[PDB]
């Protein structure tokens, strides 16, 4: 949709906040203690940035553990909604996977190829720019598909049909996602990020219809709540310190801070769930 | 500047929220009991817009009370940052004043003029598409200048210099504004609305250096804090009610809700003051 | 020349620094004690701005005194190199003069008409945009011409010929200007402002050739030196306080500060002279 | 950004001052006795350019001494902010290094390549027109990275993160830069050259957070202060010598003289430090 | 407090420097041409003491001019921090005023009284050994209060509160003092003389909160800077002239010279202002 | 004299400024480059303190070098005017000397015994509290005497007679001292510190009378000038940072700063000399 233009235009802010390096993640970070680190020695934007980065990697490491990526994500896999390729390179390098990276933000694909060349995995990571519900996917059967915080953009009934045609029997669909637990329980997240979160039931119903079984359903809501404290704290540090900010840039950072507070309030209100689902194709 | 274009762009989203009147207002509302009305069983967008418009009108009635608009605001006045003309029309109609309405949003100028005719005061209300800190003084001396929530956009020293030359001696400068009470006290407000809020002392110093005497200072922070609850409710009523909203306007509305939530929290955090000021030349 | 484009493009900085109001001056200020005021209660940019403005008006008041503007500048006069009209309105209002305001910066003429309307002298102040050495000047004989800090842009032999045709006998040419006293003694001023300052002899030679006599020659170098301290101090205050400055705006202010220091050093090196000349047409 | 365009624009005024070589350098000179040569009876522009170029070359010789470029700077290195390639060529020729020269001025990239061929090291020197804080890591691990007067343009935390991924363990990061020694100590330098200078501690903190160890810190403020006297003299020699200078370029030269005068004063005011740093991964 | 004892201790070293008069003054001198007299071929301690005493007297004559002591300082006044009574006697004799002289140095009170008799105004000059911020109001309303170089020792808010109750409406408060013009601008002065100097704004704020209006503000920094040269010269003339000085008093004199040298440097550094202020109740 | 009471009472300030540890020096520091170090990373009082301490040790190391302490100061020696024992322990430990430490400040002797016990040299360092010109010195002939910045307190004719009786033939008198080169050229130093500096001629005349020859005369004025910059800078840092200072303590620090500036000005005025003399007994 317009979401590809919305993801295009914030390329600059993502590299500012979640860069640099070759692996830039754009998803919430995982704090296995449900507590944000205390930042004392160093309260500059770069301190929160590196802490956000490290715990965003912690999210991937945690997922590969509970999903047993050693055998389930080491083969030929789809990285649906790849962002800037942080996840894509993570599977390619940590588990040797051959990755097809999918995005509807064209500005992003060349960045992912750059970063893959960079780490030397350009022969095992490929991008393609299309909608993930209409994608023609040459590349034979894939052993798995991973969606880190992108399935909220998808039509789930139709998306799971798509994956049923391109995933071999017994292949996995691994989803990290914001879900509702009550109705409207993720509205702040939904309206601000142009997503349409549903319940875990909705995902399971749509996946069952296309021939997938739910084999794992993990609640990481409490372990990802600290991400909003760090995300907020970073935004405050930039506003507080950098005096080269134009009035326009300063207002976007302000709007980002205002949103991070309302998102963090929602996260703990009990109406949403940060989940890790894994489906197996029947 | 980019602000004048920023006001141009939000003309439609702002007639939706605060229209249609012939008076559309773009300032916080004044709730004299310092609490929003409990909204009954009608919690639709129009129920809240009507309440927002009501207390927006009340803010001007209250300003007119404490300023004694009978004598001070009933002559040849500048409406500096007229928005969509709601304040301009107010002074023309309720106090028989002749009003020159200044803005840097050129799209808003026709709207103020069209509404001036439909009220039959088009012969008492002209517009000036210019910067407030470069005001044409041809147009003779003015009796007073009123700035309802616009002066956070101004270079106060320079603006008061301009006012010192266009305003007769004893002329009043009537200001409603968000001021700081401490450093960084209005940062959400400042960074979201593209303003540079300053303290009351800052304003009095700049006015003095241009020959102006601060003669009145009222704190109305408590009475305007409920505006954020009604403004937040209206936004929720829209996201909740109409499922024929495009994803793009649904996301803009969402961002406004997060903003209103951050803005109202800062309104009560202590660092900010919604104030009413009057200077005399 | 290109000087009109150079004067056009700094319209923004002049209003920032020497505005607002209706009378914006762009010339050095006059401090009759040869001492800059001590700024203590208020060291914000607006304090220095108002002090610069007030002493720039002091320059005009001082000039009208030593030039006896009551009879010499109350008639029909040429304001050559009018800037933004500060001088022009000053003669029009203080002494009732009918002013023809001349500039080679077209962006500036509409600003001067605006300010003249503003003060109600639009029937007694007119602009025309041309080079001051090729100007066709309808408007009969003029009783005087005033040039506040503009004659450094002119060919003096040719300019004085021009004034000899349009000034009645016994009319005055009033010049405030930077002059050299030694060779190269105004080079910092000259190269930075695109002027060509000469000596007082050079001016007198060129004016004698076209039929003018030098009747007054005043040295205001010491009374205008404090202007550089205030001009510098303002520039520092803006840089020090305003945190909305872009890197580009901050570098121009820095470059302005660097120039104000070198100009202030030149001013006192003994090589230049801030002069007030008055010539009478023979 | 606007900086990369700002470097594009001054290509001609900078080949005039520091060319023609095949090595053109755009960093201060190093005067080991901390004083400029007394210039004899030849005080022409070329006399000063030759002296400027001499000590610019000496700065790289001195950096190569204290860094031991024999082993640390003789492999596959990044030349981050290569200017017109003078430093790049230096490492290729004097230390038999293979050099990838990074800039954000696209006009400068052909000039660096052309000069790499004319020296016969075009097979040891490639260019990368990109931002330094988004460096292509395809191109294998590098031995070291050198930044002569470019890092004031960088986001140091982010830049060191990028370096942590492109540089082998034990790889060196060699920096010559203007640092602050106190707040606002390099403001003339910063506001004129579009940099954000920071202290040595700032640099070590950002390097640490990316796994880098500060292993060397040399103060060369005294030895580089005369550069401003030679740079100022050159400019004066040009304004003084050639009367076939257009008013526009005569005014640009004049502004550079006022700048050099303000820059050299700040160099001795205490608030700034011209330093040489080396980090190890 | 310890200050009142600190004034007690320097009674002899201060009669030596500024005596014997019947008027001994302990404030800087006022040099109307802003330069010390060139001292001829007599450069003895008494030559300089005479010059110091001369311009100390002139400071009070000048204060009396700008304050119009004819009407404002010729009634029932407080001399707050009277020192050794030189200012007290001045107002009694030159302006026919009745003076209540306040100090916290109990040793100084007899000296002020003895000198009041020897001038024949002992019936117009009484003393009050107390703290200035706890003044006995029994003694009826006063016409004015004058504080020559004593108010740096006061809690200004509290002091002005006390003044608001002892001074009739329209009563004047006349102050000569070292003020700051910027933070830390009078630190040598403050730390050596045990004062807490504040800005002129600080003083006006505290006076306002007690119902006082600042009506006059004169800067006399230039005219009092030579005092430090004469005060330094006097000290040198003493160390140089008399070889029957004990090592202990020779070291005290030496320390005073280093102090005067540091004090006079700070007087011209910009951070300080010797000012004359008048408030009206 | 009263000088012992003056040295007693500033025990507190010396430990604050030149402590802690076991070796506290009270003499100027030696900067072999004639340049004070640039303090940038750390401008707290402790940075200047440690730099002052290190260069005060540098003074002793420099003296032992030019005096060849390996054989001239390793034997049984007098440390006249020992301060808090910094010099005394330095000879005892670095060259194995047996030290008799002399002072007229009794508060100081127990501090020196404490510090000697501390370093384990209590059997080779002894204090005695008396005037250095009337001292009965049991302890046989001494091989040398050292006076670091104390001889300014002594009657030189009489003091050298004293040393002639207690020093074996060929023994050394090693003096570090402020000397005048012009008359009054050390007055600031003299009056502030209760010393009576004389010229090098005066010292040589008095030492010749008691049977000593001047064999070495070194000018260290330029190498010790940076000490005043550091001493001043420390005093400023304490005043600037510590907010627990009483008004009385703050005024003494101020008075100290005022003195350090006038002492530093004197040091470079050309009227005084920081000298290292060595005399040999005939
Ligand atoms: N309709 C659609 N089809 C394909 N990709 C989409 C899409 N809508 C959104 N996306 C992509 O989904 C991603 C959401 S955030 C990126 C997530 C990334 N895997 C990470 O965690 O690092 C973006 O890359 C966005 O471009
Ligand atoms: N620089 C500028 N010059 C003139 N008007 C400006 C301005 N910057 C902002 N404004 C105007 O000031 C107004 C701010 S909000 C509108 C306030 C209006 N009185 C009301 O209460 O409805 C807008 O009209 C905006 O366009
Ligand atoms: N060749 C030329 N012909 C006419 N005007 C010129 C000119 N060159 C420069 N000027 C004008 O001379 C002025 C110099 S500064 C403006 C001076 C003004 N009178 C004041 O003091 O307020 C500018 O207005 C500039 O546009
Ligand atoms: N963001 C950025 N990314 C990459 N290079 C940059 C940059 N910003 C500035 N630079 C480059 O850094 C250099 C700064 S000055 C040139 C330094 C060069 N080593 C020499 O001494 O000659 C310029 O080449 C400039 O274009
Ligand atoms: N707390 C206090 N209460 C009353 N007097 C005080 C005081 N602290 C200081 N003073 C006095 O104020 C005077 C300061 S200096 C003496 C000033 C005197 N008017 C003159 O010019 O000679 C001293 O007399 C001192 O004792
Ligand atoms: N008349 C006297 N007799 C003996 N010692 C004296 C003296 N007068 C001063 N002194 C001592 O001389 C010393 C001067 S400063 C201390 C110097 C010490 N050697 C050091 O550099 O670390 C003090 O210890 C002081 O007490």
Secondary structure of chain E as H, E, C letters = CHHHHHHHHCHHHHHHHHCCCCCCCCCCCCCCCCCCCCCCCCCCHHHHHHHHHHHHHHHHHHHHHHHCHHHHCCCEEEEECCCCCHHHHHHHHHHCCEEEEEECCCCHHHHHHHHHHHCCCCCCEEEEECCCCCCCCCCCCEEEEEEECCHHHCCHHHHHHHHHHHEEEEEEEEEEEEEECCCCCCHHHHHHHCCCCCCHHHHHHHHHHCCCEEEEEEECHHHHHHHHHHHHHHHHHHHHHCCCCCHHHHHHHHHHHHHHHHHHHHHHCCCEEEEEEEEEC
Task: Assess D241–C contact: CB distance below 8 Å, yes or no.
Answer: no
CA-proximal residue: ligand 3, atom 19 (nearest)? C82
Q: Whose CA is nearest to atom 1 of ligand 3?
A: C131
Q: Are A148 and A162 in contact (CB under 8 A)?
A: no
Cα–Cα distances (Å) from B4 to B11, B29, B106, B129, B188, in that order, read: 11, 23, 8, 10, 20
Q: Is residue F274 part of a domain?
A: yes
Residue A240: closest C-alpha in chain C:
C243
| Atom 16 of ligand 4, nearest CA residue | D83
Domain of A160, CATH number, reads: 3.40.50.150
DSSP D37: P
Task: List, chain by chain if needed, residues with CB within 6 Å of any ligand 6 atom.
Answer: F 3, 7, 25-27, 81-83, 86-87, 102-105, 131-132, 148-150, 153
Cis peptide before E20, with omega less than 30 degrees from 0?
yes
Domain, as residue range, for E106: 8-225+259-280
Q: The tokens of C159 are what? A: 């300019």
Task: Write the DSSP string, F36-94.
Answer: PPP--S--SHHHHHHHHHHHHHHHHHHHHHHTTHHHHSSSEEEEES-TTSHHHHHHHHH
In this structure, the residue with its CA closest to atom 18 of ligand 5 is: E83
Residue C112 near residue C101 (C-beta atoms within 8 A): yes
Residue E13, domain member (yes or no): yes
* Closest chain F residue by Cα to residue E183: F240
CB atoms within 10 A of CB F213: 12
Pick the ligand that lies closest to the CA of residue C145. 3
Q: Please tell me the distance from the alpha carbon of residue E35 to that of residue E51, in angstroms, as a whole number.
A: 12
Examine residue E252 and state whether it is found in any structural domain, yes or no.
no
Using the mean position of ligand 1's atoms as its centre, give its distance from the Cα of residue B105 in Å: 37
Structural domains in chain B (count): 1
CB contact under 8 A, A20 and D155: yes
3-class DSSP state for residue B88?
Answer: helix
Nearest residue on chain C to A244, alpha-carbon basis: C246
In the sheet that holds A98-103, the strands lie side by side as A125-129, A98-103, A76-80, A142-148, A167-180, A272-281, A212-219
- For chains B and A, having 3+ Cβ pairs within 8 Å is answered yes
B35-42's contacts with Cβ under 8 Å and 24+ in sequence apart are B35/B226, B36/B226, B36/B229, B36/B230, B39/B233
Task: Please state, in angstroms and as integers, the Cα–Cα distance from residue D252 to each residue in D25, D182, D234, D247, following that order.
Answer: 20, 31, 14, 9
Q: Helix (H, G, I), strand (E, B), or coil: what is residue B122?
A: coil
Closest ligand to the CA of A112: 1
Cα separation, E231 vs E257, whole angstroms: 8
Name the packing angle between helices C200-209 and C156-166 (round to 10°): 40
Tokens read off for E56: 């100390």
Distance CA C243, CA F89 (A): 56
Q: What is the resolution of this structure in A?
A: 2.6
Which residues are within 8 A (CB) of D229 and not within 5 positions of it... i.e. 6 or more apart? D36, D264
Tell whether E143 is covered by a domain. Answer: yes
Query: Is any ligand 1 atom within 6 A of the Cβ of residue A26?
Result: yes
Chain B residue with CA closest to A2: the answer is B248
- Omega cis (within 30) before C20: yes
Tell me if A8 CB under 6 Å of ligand 1: no
A244, A247, A250 member nearest C247 (Cβ):
A244
Edge to edge, the sheet with strand E76-80 lists: E125-129, E98-103, E76-80, E142-148, E167-180, E272-280, E213-219
3 state SS of C82: coil
8 Å CB contact between F188 and F262: yes
With residue A78 as reference, give the H or E element that holds it.
strand A76-80
* Gap from CA of E219 to ligand 5 centroid (Å): 22
Specify the length of chain F in residues: 282
Inform me whether the C-beta atom of residue F41 falls under 8 Å from chain D C-beta atoms.
yes
For residue C148 and ligand 3, the question of a CB distance below 6 A is answered with: yes
Tell me the residues of chain D between 125 and 144 that have a Cβ less than 8 Å away from chain A.
Answer: 133-140
Collapsing DSSP states into helix, strand and coil, what is residue C282?
coil
Chains D and F: how many Cβ contacts under 8 Å?
12
Q: E98 lies in a domain?
A: yes
The alpha carbon of residue D148 and the mean position of all alpha carbons in its chain are separated, in whole angstroms, by: 4
Nearest CA, atom 16, ligand 6 = F83
Can you name the residues that pair with A79 across neighbouring β-strands? Answer: A101, A146
- Within 10 Å of residue E65's Cβ, how many Cβ atoms? 10
C-beta of residue D221 within 8 angstroms of C-beta of residue D272: yes
**How remote is the CA of residue B102 from the centroid of ligand 2, in Å?**
8
User: What's the A53 CA to ligand 4 centre distance in angstroms?
Assistant: 28
Partner-chain contact A194 B251, CB within 8 Å:
yes
B209 close to C (CB below 8 A): yes
B237 lies in a domain? no
Q: Is residue D65 part of a domain?
A: yes
Å from C72 to nearest chain B CA?
A: 27
CA distance B63 to B60: 5
- CB proximity C246 to E under 8 Å: no
- Quickly tell me which residue has 């090592």 as its tokens: E247
Residues ≥6 apart with Cβ < 8 Å to A52:
A17, A18, A29, A227, A230, A231, A234
Cα(C94)–Cα(F282) distance, integer angstroms:
95
d(CA A166, CA A146): 13
Would you tell me how many other CB atoms lie within 10 Å of the CB of residue A139? 13
* Distance (Å) from CA C101 to ligand 3 centroid: 10
CA–CA min distance A226, chain D (Å): 21
**Method in brief:** X-ray
Q: Measure C80 CA to ligand 3 centroid, in angstroms.
A: 7
* Token reading at A19: 């860069």
Query: Are A117 and D136 a contacting pair at CB < 8 A?
Result: yes
Q: How far is F96 from chain E (nearest CA, A)?
A: 38
The closest alpha carbon to D98, from D120, D115, D73, D75, belongs to D75
Strands A212-219 and A272-281, sheet pairing = antiparallel
Q: Are C273 and C221 in contact (CB under 8 A)?
A: yes
Longest dimension (CA), chain D: 56
C78: distance to nearest CA of chain E, Å? Answer: 43
Q: What angle do CA D140, D142, D148 make, to 5 degrees?
A: 135
Residue A149 CA: nearest ligand 1 atom is: 17
Contact status of A40 with chain C (Cβ, < 8 Å):
no
The strand pair at E272-280 and D213-219 is best described as: unpaired
Cα(C214)–Cα(C279) distance, integer angstroms: 5
Q: How far is the CA of E150 from the centre of ligand 5 (A)?
A: 5
CB atoms within 10 A of CB E98: 17
Taking alpha carbons only, the member of D137, D163, D133 closest to residue D281 is D163
Residues in chain D: 281
B83 CA: nearest ligand 2 atom: 24
Residue D235 falls inside a structural domain:
no
Give the residue from F6, F136, F137, F11 showing the smallest Cα distance to F85.
F11
Is C255 in contact with D254 (Cβ distance < 8 A)? Answer: no
Cβ neighbours of A241 in C, within 8 Å: none
Q: Give the nearest chain C residue to A242 (CA atoms).
A: C243
In chain D, the residue whose alpha carbon lies closest to the alpha carbon of F37 is: D219
Q: Determine, for residues D261 and C257 on separate chains, whether the beta-carbon distance falls below 8 Å.
A: no
For residue A233 the two structure tokens come to 């704290």
Nearest listed ligand to the Cα of residue B9: 2
Q: How far is CA C126 from the centre of its chain?
A: 18
Which residue carries 């005025």 as its tokens? F269
B150, E66, E272 from C33: Cα distances, Å: 41, 21, 21
B165 and chain C in contact, CB less than 8 A:
yes
Set of chain C residues whose Cβ sits within 8 Å of the Cβ of D259: 255, 258
**Interchain contact F38–D (C-beta under 8 A):** yes
- For chain A, list the contacting chains (3+ Cβ pairs, <8 Å): B, C, D
- Name which of A187, A194, A258 is nearest B247 (Cβ-Cβ): A194
Q: Is the CB of D158 under 6 A from ligand 4?
A: no
CB contacts of E277 in chain C (<8 Å) are: none
């Amino acid at each position: 949709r317009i979401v590809g233009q919305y993801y295009d235009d914030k390329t600059a802010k993502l590299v500012r906040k979640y860069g640099p390096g070759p692996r830039i993640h754009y998803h919430v970070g995982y704090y296995p203690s449900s507590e944000a680190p205390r930042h004392t020695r160093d309260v500059t934007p770069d301190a929160f940035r590196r802490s956000i980065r490290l715990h965003q990697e912690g999210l991937l490491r945690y997922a590969a553990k509970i999903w047993g990526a050693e055998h389930r994500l080491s083969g030929r896999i789809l990285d649906v909604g790849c962002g800037l390729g942080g996840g894509s390179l993570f599977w390619a390098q940590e588990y040797g996977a051959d990755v097809t990276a999918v995005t509807n933000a064209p500005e992003h694909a060349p960045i992912v190829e750059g970063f893959a060349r960079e780490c030397g995995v350009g022969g095992r990571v490929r991008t393609l720019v299309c909608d993930a519900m209409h994608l023609p996917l040459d590349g034979g059967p894939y052993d798995a598909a991973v969606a880190i915080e992108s399935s909220g953009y998808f039509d789930r009934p139709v998306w799971f049909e798509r994956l049923a045609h391109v995933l071999r029997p017994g292949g996995s669909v691994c989803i990290e996602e914001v879900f509702t637990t009550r109705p409207h329980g993720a509205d702040v997240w939904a309206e601000y990020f142009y997503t349409k979160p549903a319940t875990v039931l909705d995902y399971a119903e749509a996946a069952k219809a296309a021939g997938f079984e739910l084999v794992d359903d993990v609640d990481a809501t409490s372990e990802t709540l600290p991400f909003w404290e760090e995300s907020t704290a970073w935004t405050k540090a930039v506003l507080d310190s950098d005096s080269t900010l134009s009035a326009v840039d300063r207002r976007q950072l302000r709007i980002s801070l205002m949103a991070n507070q309302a998102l963090g309030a929602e996260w703990q209100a009990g109406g949403l769930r940060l989940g890790f689902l894994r489906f197996e194709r029947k």
